[PDB]
Ligand binder design. Structure first.
Ligand SMILES: COCC(COC)n1c(-c2cc(C)c(=O)n(C)c2)nc2cc(N3CCOCC3)ccc21
Length: 113
């Protein structure tokens, strides 16, 4: 019942929700690492120094890599920030990031004390 454990449970619930069918219509571009070569995005790794995606957040949670909620939240926000950095703000993927980040921020704010 440690505070860090309990907050990490809330983080894991958020993570499960972001990966759930409820949000699938807009969450899917964040499921796997951006495959820059496959998508023809040959500048992606010159612009984004620290790629992040929900499969990587899941592997790090399963590995007990995150020591607290703050470390978890940093990777999820790195994923969104990467999207806002690389993409013109009017691109479909940006609208999808905005929507999924709204899901994230509102539930992250319900963190237990
Ligand atoms: C809505 O996203 C559109 C972009 C298009 O990039 C060229 N996109 C990204 C993508 C995502 C992010 C976060 C980003 O910043 N960029 C630039 C592209 N990842 C993708 C993966 C796929 N597929 C098709 C379905 O099976 C899986 C592979 C298809 C499109 C994708």
């Amino acid at each position: 019942m440690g505070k860090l454990s309990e907050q990490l449970k809330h983080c894991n619930g958020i993570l499960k929700e972001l990966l759930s069918k409820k949000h699938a219509a807009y969450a899917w571009p964040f499921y796997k690492p951006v495959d820059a070569s496959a998508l023809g995005l040959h500048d992606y790794h010159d612009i984004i120094k620290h790629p992040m995606d929900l499969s990587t957040v899941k592997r790090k949670m399963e590995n007990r890599d995150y020591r607290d909620a703050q470390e978890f939240a940093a990777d999820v926000r790195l994923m969104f920030s990467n999207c806002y950095k690389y993409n013109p703000p009017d691109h479909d993927v940006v609208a999808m990031a905005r929507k999924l980040q709204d899901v994230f921020e509102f539930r992250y704010a319900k963190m237990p004390d």
